Amino acid sequence: MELYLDTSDVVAVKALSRIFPLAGVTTNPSIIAAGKKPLDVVLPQLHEAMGGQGRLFAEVMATTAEGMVNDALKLRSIIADIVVKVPVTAEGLAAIKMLKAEGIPTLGTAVYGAAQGLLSALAGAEYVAPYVNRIDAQGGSGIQTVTDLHQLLKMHAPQAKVLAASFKTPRQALDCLLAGCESITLPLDVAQQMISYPAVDAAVAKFEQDWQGAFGRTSI
Amino acid sequence: MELYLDTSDVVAVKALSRIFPLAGVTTNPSIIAAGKKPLDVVLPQLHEAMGGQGRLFAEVMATTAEGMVNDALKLRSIIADIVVKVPVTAEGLAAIKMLKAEGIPTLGTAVYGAAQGLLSALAGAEYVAPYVNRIDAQGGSGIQTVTDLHQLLKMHAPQAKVLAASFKTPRQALDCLLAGCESITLPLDVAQQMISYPAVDAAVAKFEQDWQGAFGRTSI
Amino acid sequence: MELYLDTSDVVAVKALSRIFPLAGVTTNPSIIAAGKKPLDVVLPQLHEAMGGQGRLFAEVMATTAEGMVNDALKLRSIIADIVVKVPVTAEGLAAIKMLKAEGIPTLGTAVYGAAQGLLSALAGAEYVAPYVNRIDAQGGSGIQTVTDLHQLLKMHAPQAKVLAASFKTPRQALDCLLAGCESITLPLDVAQQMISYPAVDAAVAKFEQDWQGAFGRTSI
Amino acid sequence: MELYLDTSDVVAVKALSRIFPLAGVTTNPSIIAAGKKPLDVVLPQLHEAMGGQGRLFAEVMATTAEGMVNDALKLRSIIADIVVKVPVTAEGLAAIKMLKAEGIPTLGTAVYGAAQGLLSALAGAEYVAPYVNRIDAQGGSGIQTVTDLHQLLKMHAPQAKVLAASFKTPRQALDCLLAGCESITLPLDVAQQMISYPAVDAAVAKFEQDWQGAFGRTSI
Amino acid sequence: MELYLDTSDVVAVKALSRIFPLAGVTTNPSIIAAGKKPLDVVLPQLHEAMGGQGRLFAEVMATTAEGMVNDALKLRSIIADIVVKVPVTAEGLAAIKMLKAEGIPTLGTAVYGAAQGLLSALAGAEYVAPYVNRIDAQGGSGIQTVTDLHQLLKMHAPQAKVLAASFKTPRQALDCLLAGCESITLPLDVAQQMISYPAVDAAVAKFEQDWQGAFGRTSI
Amino acid sequence: MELYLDTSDVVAVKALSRIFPLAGVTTNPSIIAAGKKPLDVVLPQLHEAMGGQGRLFAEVMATTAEGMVNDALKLRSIIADIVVKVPVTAEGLAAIKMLKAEGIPTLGTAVYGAAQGLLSALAGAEYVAPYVNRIDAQGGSGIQTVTDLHQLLKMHAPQAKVLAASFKTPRQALDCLLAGCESITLPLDVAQQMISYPAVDAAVAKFEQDWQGAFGRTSI
Amino acid sequence: MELYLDTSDVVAVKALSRIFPLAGVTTNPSIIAAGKKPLDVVLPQLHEAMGGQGRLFAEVMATTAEGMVNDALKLRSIIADIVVKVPVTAEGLAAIKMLKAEGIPTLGTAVYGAAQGLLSALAGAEYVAPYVNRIDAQGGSGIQTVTDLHQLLKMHAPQAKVLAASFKTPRQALDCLLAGCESITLPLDVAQQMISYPAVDAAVAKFEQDWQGAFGRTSI
Amino acid sequence: MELYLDTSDVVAVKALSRIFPLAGVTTNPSIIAAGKKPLDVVLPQLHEAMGGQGRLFAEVMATTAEGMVNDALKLRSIIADIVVKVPVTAEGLAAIKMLKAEGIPTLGTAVYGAAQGLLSALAGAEYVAPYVNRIDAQGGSGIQTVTDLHQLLKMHAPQAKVLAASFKTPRQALDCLLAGCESITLPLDVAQQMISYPAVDAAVAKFEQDWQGAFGRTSI
Amino acid sequence: MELYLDTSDVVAVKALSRIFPLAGVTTNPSIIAAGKKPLDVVLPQLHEAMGGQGRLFAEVMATTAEGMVNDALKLRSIIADIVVKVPVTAEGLAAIKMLKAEGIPTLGTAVYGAAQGLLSALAGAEYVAPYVNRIDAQGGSGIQTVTDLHQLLKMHAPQAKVLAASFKTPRQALDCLLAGCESITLPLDVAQQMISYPAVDAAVAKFEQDWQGAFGRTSI
């Protein structure tokens, strides 16, 4: 399991990296844009925020396969081992094949269907990123798409990994993980919810009270 | 997973070969007929349209096992590594056994039943092609036949492959792939649908607009 | 069950009306555009092609609720008992509410999600038309959407009817009918595949042979 | 099915009331407080924003059953037909019983468990509102709780209705409706997602474009 | 649904009676012993603990049908409308028949098996009380016995009611109610757990905190 | 639910008829033979030992339909309201049709499959008796046969009743009852096991022990 | 998968042996008898008619184990590597154990139950032959018996093989193959049906017509 | 799969051992009692009845761990390699641990629950013997228990074997085997039913008849 | 399987360690507080109570990751090989990473959700302990959580073990074991119920009575 945060918030990443067992950070264009720092600024910052380890992801912007390959080369010049996200469109598929021939690792993103995602993996993508919540919002089942995609990769491209993305609630992430997703990337709010629970807090408070009641202190 | 296109449209194969990760092109007698070019023309053209690589399939026309085997020999003289499609009839089965002895790889085609398919695999066919949409159109369940056939091959002829064929909608293709089909062949309309999604276009445009608003350009 | 054809082909409708037990004809803006005849010609012609009986459907075009209400009155002035199709968008939902209050029967169309469809029924629509094959083409499940939607109407709008539409294969129509759709509209190709079967024709021919054989003719 | 908005945003309620077939508006202490207008201001504003019809909900703040009854009366004096939301705690249950005896309609809220919910209905509550996303966020299954609660009400308190609440994604709302909830309240973002889809916009645009292109007209 | 407490703790019954919508109190010989007061003292006290209303249950001690009937009469002379609990043994069944002839309502108790329970109802028992937790503790499935019992009664003795008893956790109680039990009796510890939740208390507190933040207090 | 004993043990019927709520007694040739008394002796005695009220069943011996109607008349001359058991064989089915025309009630017995059983109900039998254990013993599923038969009667002969017979263990009886059998006949050993349980006896003794510990006596 | 024909029709076997991939021919005493040729005549004729290779099966007639052993030796002296079919009776079981000691391969035949079949494998039978259609015809489920048997062998006698037999329709053979049977033997009529399909013939005819239409011939 | 007879009937064991593939014989205190011969007489006779091979089981009678160990040594002094059956009680568990330290193989018997069974395997028992029919007779599911137990040993004590015991009907035996029991012990009645079937006898008779008609004799 | 007692009752641990096959003892702050002895007294005692063998667990009290690590070192200086329980909160997760780096084995405790559990394992916890009964009590499903948790560890952290804890009834423990938990800790009451069954005692009693009746004593 590779656990990622889906963010460009460098400060939050450094703070959460001591808490969570993080494999890295994923970004996309909207997330980069929301943070306002350019790629060649934020990427190295995010790399530093995890102590110079872990895996980063960032997305091409060009519209033609050749442009996307050139984006990829730029991105790799910024972080030498970065994984390059390519949206799974006709040209994106073409770019994924060309990038496979160049030894540049890719992830097929903006995946709204299982077959589509599979095709990215067959073209060479190492990761495929279905947009779970988007699919849920638009009247589908993100979980079924994921389940299906995961089945397809397991049968048809077993070195490729699902990187489940787009979350509004912890339950979605849980269901992706239950479906066997080898990787997942969480926005900050959902990640925080996943480790903070009133029932857990009440259990700890209770241990503290019982311990006080018998020993006159709450410390060991 | 071997992905094929089911077409005799040479220009289209040239264009789509850079997009899709194609293992090759399949043809059948109707598909050749629709293209109007003879086999000894269209086949080499198809081979060159995939840059001199990949696998082709073409179908015998004779009615007797002996004729089918001569048909096979002619097809091989056109494309040396072609896989010969034989309809899974009585004579077809005999032809498949004969061609197995000769080392000419075959596909058992026009399969409308699971046991029928299995018989072609036991007789020697490397591939078995159920006609998914014809089974659906004629009041059956193409997906159930594909599921049953796959189970049968996996248990009883584990080196034979299902090459699902005959599609009107991506959902059929998806379901064949979810059933574990090792290979598949798509007509051009369904292949195009499988990589074109309004929800994907909208996601990519939103990325473009957010990037424009933050950085004043749409390039990286 | 109300069985419709999805066509503006008057000649085909007349010929097929003596074979199928039709409840009428559905049109939509592209179907009408293809046929090149304006509505005030095609609609009465379709009405006539079914001997003055049956039910018709045609779609509004305007972008605003007010516009769509005016489109509906115009449609009603061409065919007085026509059911007006309204796309299930925000403005369309507003139009459906207004049309309910004016006693003008509506169908909620362009339905790609269950909840969307349910909303059109709760706003007053008498029919809800999911686009089965489009949902299938775009990596969803047409059949699950139809099932979900039908369950939603039966629980929460029990007098509203599903009118399943958008078909590439008889299997989609069969599954919609098995799911309990109260109505359905078939394009001409799917409708004709629904009544033509090689096995049936073989059975009938065998009957003829055996009769010839015992009686010296194929007639009674 | 009764459809509510979960909001204190008067301008948004008025705008959306012409689109959706709304039964009313629900509020709770957090929603009221984010709007900053006090109850004696917002509630009549919300009532008017729906043309003085439909149903309203608001929540008691007191911690004692006696206080809760007194808060009910304050609420009823602002809106004579309001439904009073009572959290389902020990004191809340006691208060629901007292309110039942006074003929003041209640809703048992802050429901995180099915049996808890049932108790509130058995005590007299007309609606039971499980917090769907809260249960999902905290490592449960909000849908399973709704399913269970709905089953329990149907068997044991058949005149009580589930009013499903707490949504981050349309999929949650869909699953609540499929589970048979008689009522539901949506925050505005989920409601807007529920009627806005790229695939639907693409379908409608294609009709528009095909229409003018047969008929140079943007309507009928 | 009839809700009982399973207890001889009069003060507790009084307190809990304002909170829960109680139908009454059940007792058994161990619960009477543990409270130390004899029946002619506690039953009237428990009756008064509920404002002279609701239903009470108490168990016969005799070994023979005859003795069990005389135990019943002594119980009825203490509380005129008490329901008499008879263990479902051979003599218990004989006793239930006799008591039915006398018009004295019974409950078949100490039920460890579904068919056993069914026999008690067919003999005239108005209620049947499977010992859910004891079945669980002894290597069976309390919930399945309950489920089987309820099916049997619904098919074969539809006016007979299940009264589920013997609980160490709310989950068992929940499962019984999900299975359709028409009545249930909870020990005090389980009942208290059924209305007290860390997550519910956290939700109330957050309401208070936001109300404070916007209005300068925690009251309406 | 009609509960029968499957026996010719007059003394045992007397005793057990006060414990169980019997509908009456079934016999068959092997059960009569084993008790050694002729039909004209036991049948009257069994009629009296179930306290003069209930149904009796006994079986014909002839091998032709005509002979079977004669046996039916002889049995009726012993017990005028007796139900006549006819083995469901070809001659038996013929006899069942005759007896139906004569207004003499039948039970189609020696039923080892579901369709066989249904045929007897279509011919006129009021009861159908599958031999459950016998089907189990000979490598089938008695419970599945009963389930299928019950289904068939319910759909196809809804006034006919299953009378499940042939039991070696209570589980078999329980499963027959779960499957909705309207009636059942138990041999004495299985009946006795159905009301005798060590866990039940231990609950009662615990109650006597706790009672006497608190009160110094065992009586109420 | 070993595919056998269930026949003594030597001429038919010669014909079908070039079409099907046969492992062999099974016989039994009714099949031999129906052919009129004694064993020492037909068994060598069948050995030839396959092509001189493969596996033969013939059944013992004796009634004691010792005589079945002498039947085994007689059969073996006609065809040295014949597999001896022994009915799974008590004496057949005893014969199977002796034959195992003597190293003569057996098949346990006339199996109507799964446990019975299992016992034959635990005794030493290499093959176990349930009679599928006999089980179906007699009110059981031949498919369930085969499925159960195959499970029993797989867990408890994994080197023994189900040889599914007794068929009236291809569907029975399909379900046996789908249940995982390692071998199967078909009567000639069911085998012919398994490779002859109106739908397949119709598909080949259409290819021929389309090819004719484009190239003016029906040859390649 | 180890197949055992549950019996102290020496003569029957000798006869049955030539029919069944027996692993040995199991006894318990009741089966020894019923045969009336003491342990030092029957155990050697049963051994010799299997020609001095296979495995024997006998049960301890003492009531404490220490006394059970002494009994184990007494049994071992009668038959040097006997498997000692220890009832799975608190003291029995302790005994099982000691006997493991002393290298004497044990069977955990009198098992009525899956977890209890498991504890006996965890304590050192090689076999665990659930009393299937006793669980059935007492209102449980012997089969669910066996399934659960087999699951537990497979996960948590994989060298330990289930030895299913206590049968009144072949079906129970069949279901134990389908649930994967490594061993089983049958009473002589059940065992005999497991090899005797009317349908099988009818099939063998039909073979004889057909043989007679073709060849004028019933031998080979 | 590792079997633990959840207790600080030294005497009970000594006595139960001769009955159960214990892997050790678990403690938590409430269990330590209830036994009233400080850690440096009970932990050594508990260790001795198991003959100086097996594994122990004890829980940190501090609120910061750093405090928690310091608590870990204190616990390790009392028992060198102890496993340190760390509540799975944000700080607990950070502590678990640190302890992993220091090579001190941990258990992630106070687990109320499956994802929370998995995070503790991904951070390096060797054991994960969901509070089964607390989840049950608070309206969830402890078994579903355990099941989900176990699936996550198996797919994503296969070296981590579920240590199921918090039990009010043996059924919960059974279901945890059936879900595949590698380890489990039982409170004393539940452990005792797991080895004491009235049905088992009656089976033993019966064996003694049959032995007496045959041999005149109850001993061997």
Q: Where do runs of H (alpha helix) occur along A19-168?
A: 29-35, 39-49, 65-78, 90-102, 114-123, 132-137, 142-156
Q: Which residues pair with D129 in a beta bridge?
A: none
How would you class B12 by CB atoms within 10 Å of its CB: exposed for 0-12, middle for 13-18, buried for 19 or more? middle
Tell me the backbone φ, ψ of residue C162, rounded to 5 degrees.
-70, 135
Nearest to B86 by CA among B52, B116, B43: B116
Q: How far apart, in whole angstroms, are the C-alpha atoms of residue G47 and residue G82?
A: 10
Element at D85 (helix H, strand E): strand D83-87
Class of H1-220 in CATH: alpha beta
Element at G185 (helix H, strand E): strand G183-186
Chain H positions in Cβ-Cβ contact with residue F198 (cut-off 8 Å):
138
- E58 and E43 Cβ atoms separated by less than 8 Å: yes
Question: Residue B171 is nearest to which of C142, C174, C199, comparing CB atoms?
Answer: C142
Q: How far D78 CA lies from chain E's nearest CA (Å)?
A: 12
Method: X-ray
CA distances from H35 to H9, H17, H27, H30, I213 (A): 7, 19, 11, 9, 12
The nearest alpha carbon in chain A to I149 belongs to: A178
Element at G175 (helix H, strand E): helix G170-178
Say how many C-beta atoms besides its own lie within 10 A of residue C214's C-beta.
8
Q: H41-60 burial by CB neighbour count: b if 16+ within 10 A, else e?
A: ebbeebbebbeeebbbbbbb
Type of residue numbered B114: A
E203 and D112: CB-CB below 8 Å? Answer: yes
Question: Residue D137 is nearest to which of A139, A142, A169, comparing CB atoms?
Answer: A169
- H62 and H70 Cβ atoms separated by less than 8 Å: yes
Q: How far I78 CA lies from chain E's nearest CA (Å)?
A: 34
- DSSP H helix total and E strand total for chain C: 11, 8
Q: How far apart, in whole angstroms, are the C-alpha atoms of residue I203 and residue I217?
A: 17
- F169 and F181 Cβ atoms separated by less than 8 Å: no
Active site residues of A: 85
Q: How far apart, in whole angstroms, are the C-alpha atoms of residue B136 and residue B139?
A: 6
Q: How far apart, in whole angstroms, are the C-alpha atoms of residue G214 and residue G90?
A: 69
DSSP output for D34-77: HH---HHHHHHHHHHHTTT-SEEEEE---SSHHHHHHHHHHHHH
CA distances from H24 to D64, H10, H28 (A): 73, 12, 14
Which residues of C lie closer than 8 Å to G, measured between beta carbons? 198-199, 201-203
Which residues lie below 8 Å from residue E77, measured CB to CB, with a gap of 6+? none
Q: How far apart, in whole angstroms, are the C-alpha atoms of residue I163 and residue I144?
A: 15
Chain H positions in Cβ-Cβ contact with residue G148 (cut-off 8 Å):
174, 178
Question: Residue B89 is nearest to which of G170, G195, G206, comparing CB atoms?
Answer: G195
Q: Both tokens of residue H57?
A: 């089981």
CA distances from A141 to D169, D172, D175, D185, I128 (A): 11, 10, 10, 21, 31
Q: How far apart, in whole angstroms, are the C-alpha atoms of residue C145 and residue G69?
A: 65
Q: How far apart, in whole angstroms, are the C-alpha atoms of residue E114 and residue F171?
A: 10
Q: What is the DSSP letter of A140?
A: S
Q: How far apart, in whole angstroms, are the C-alpha atoms of residue F168 and residue F187?
A: 8
Q: I45-72 burial by CB neighbour count: b if 16+ within 10 A, else e?
A: bbbebbeeebbbbbbbbbbebebbbbbb
Q: How far apart, in whole angstroms, are the C-alpha atoms of residue G106 and residue G100?
A: 8
Q: What angle do CA E110, E114, E118 make, to 5 degrees?
A: 85
H113 and E140: CB-CB below 8 Å? Answer: yes
Tell me the backbone φ, ψ of residue B13, rounded to 5 degrees.
-60, -40
Q: Both tokens of residue C77?
A: 């002035």
Q: What angle do CA E206, E211, E214 make, to 5 degrees?
A: 130
- G179 and G145 Cβ atoms separated by less than 8 Å: no
Which residues of F lie closer than 8 Å to H, measured between beta carbons? 133, 136-139, 141-142, 168-172, 174, 193, 197-199
Q: Is D139 left (phi over 0), alpha (psi -120 to 50) or beta?
A: left
How would you class E26 by CB atoms within 10 Å of its CB: exposed for 0-12, middle for 13-18, buried for 19 or more? buried
How would you class E215 by CB atoms within 10 Å of its CB: exposed for 0-12, middle for 13-18, buried for 19 or more? middle
Q: What is the DSSP letter of I82?
A: P
Helix pair C114-122, C90-101: axis angle to 10 deg: 30
A113 and C140: CB-CB below 8 Å? Answer: yes
Beta strands in chain F (DSSP E): 2-6, 24-26, 55-59, 83-87, 106-111, 127-130, 161-164, 183-186
Q: Tell me if there are at least 3 CB pairs under 8 Å linking chains A and F.
A: no
Q: What is the DSSP letter of A177?
A: H
Distance of CA G164 to the CA centre of its chain: 6
Q: Both tokens of residue A5?
A: 């945060």
- E14 and E37 Cβ atoms separated by less than 8 Å: no
Chain C positions in Cβ-Cβ contact with residue D151 (cut-off 8 Å):
none
Q: How far apart, in whole angstroms, are the C-alpha atoms of residue I186 and residue I164?
A: 9
Q: What is the DSSP letter of A165?
A: B
- G33 and H210 Cβ atoms separated by less than 8 Å: yes
Tell me the backbone φ, ψ of residue C2, rounded to 5 degrees.
-115, 120
Helix (H, G, I), strand (E, B), or coil: what is residue H2?
strand
C140 and A115: CB-CB below 8 Å? Answer: no
Q: What is the DSSP letter of B130?
A: E
Helix pair E142-156, F170-178: axis angle to 10 deg: 60
Q: Is H73 left (phi over 0), alpha (psi -120 to 50) or beta?
A: alpha
Q: What angle do CA E21, E24, E27 make, to 5 degrees?
A: 140
Q: Which residues pair with B26 in a beta bridge?
A: B6, B57
Q: How far apart, in whole angstroms, are the C-alpha atoms of residue A88 and residue A66?
A: 15
Nearest to C186 by CA among C14, C16, C11: C16
Say how many C-beta atoms besides its own lie within 10 A of residue B90's C-beta.
17
Q: Which residues pair with C24 in a beta bridge?
A: C4, C55
Q: Where do runs of H (alpha helix) occur along chain H?
A: 10-16, 29-35, 39-49, 65-78, 90-101, 114-123, 132-137, 142-156, 170-178, 188-193, 198-215
Q: How far A201 CA lies from chain I's nearest CA (Å)?
A: 8
Nearest to B8 by CA among B28, F180, B19, B21: B28
B18 and A97: CB-CB below 8 Å? Answer: yes
Q: Which of G1, G14, G17, G19 to mutate to test binding with chain B, by most B CBs within 10 Å of its CB?
A: G19
Q: What is the DSSP letter of I113?
A: S
> Which chains contact F through at least 3 pairs of Cβ atoms less than 8 Å apart?
E, G, H, I
Q: Tell me if there are at least 3 CB pairs under 8 Å linking chains A and E.
A: yes
Q: How far C56 CA lies from chain D's nearest CA (Å)?
A: 16
Q: How far apart, in whole angstroms, are the C-alpha atoms of residue D22 and residue C220?
A: 66
- B56 and B85 Cβ atoms separated by less than 8 Å: no
Nearest to B111 by CA among B161, B154, B62, B155: B161
| Greatest alpha-carbon span in chain H | 71
Which residues of D lie closer than 8 Å to I, measured between beta carbons? 112-116, 138-141, 144-145
- G67 and G88 Cβ atoms separated by less than 8 Å: no
Helix (H, G, I), strand (E, B), or coil: what is residue C94?
helix
**Annotated catalytic residue: which of B14, B36, B74, B85?**
B85
Question: Residue B139 is nearest to which of C138, C139, C197, comparing CB atoms?
Answer: C197
Nearest to C149 by CA among C108, C186, C187, C190: C108
The nearest alpha carbon in chain H to I2 belongs to: H156
Q: Are strands G183-186 and H2-6 parallel, antiparallel or unpaired?
A: unpaired
Nearest to B100 by CA among B43, B157, B52: B157
C199 and G201: CB-CB below 8 Å? Answer: no
Helix pair C39-49, C10-17: axis angle to 10 deg: 10
Helix (H, G, I), strand (E, B), or coil: what is residue H32?
helix
Type of residue numbered F197: Y
H155 and I180: CB-CB below 8 Å? Answer: yes
Helix (H, G, I), strand (E, B), or coil: what is residue F56?
strand
- C95 and C86 Cβ atoms separated by less than 8 Å: yes
Q: How far C217 CA lies from chain D's nearest CA (Å)?
A: 55
F114 and G139: CB-CB below 8 Å? Answer: yes
Which residues lie below 8 Å from residue E188, measured CB to CB, with a gap of 6+? E5, E7, E9, E12, E16
Nearest to C173 by CA among C110, C116, C121, C130: C130
Q: How far apart, in whole angstroms, are the C-alpha atoms of residue G90 and residue G86?
A: 11
Which residues lie below 8 Å from residue A18, measured CB to CB, with a gap of 6+? I65, I94, I97
Active site residues of I: 85
Q: What is the C-alpha R_g of chain B? A: 20
Q: Tell me if there are at least 3 CB pairs under 8 Å linking chains D and F.
A: no
Q: What is the DSSP letter of E218?
A: S
Q: How far apart, in whole angstroms, are the C-alpha atoms of residue D27 and residue D25?
A: 7
- H163 and H131 Cβ atoms separated by less than 8 Å: no
Q: Tell me if there are at least 3 CB pairs under 8 Å linking chains I and E.
A: yes
- F111 and F88 Cβ atoms separated by less than 8 Å: yes
Type of residue numbered G124: G
Q: What angle do CA C54, C58, C60 make, to 5 degrees?
A: 155
How would you class C160 by CB atoms within 10 Å of its CB: exposed for 0-12, middle for 13-18, buried for 19 or more? buried
Q: Both tokens of residue F102?
A: 């004569």
Helix pair C142-156, C114-122: axis angle to 10 deg: 30
Q: How far apart, in whole angstroms, are the C-alpha atoms of residue I39 and residue I56?
A: 12
Q: Both tokens of residue I207?
A: 């064996």
- I126 and I161 Cβ atoms separated by less than 8 Å: yes
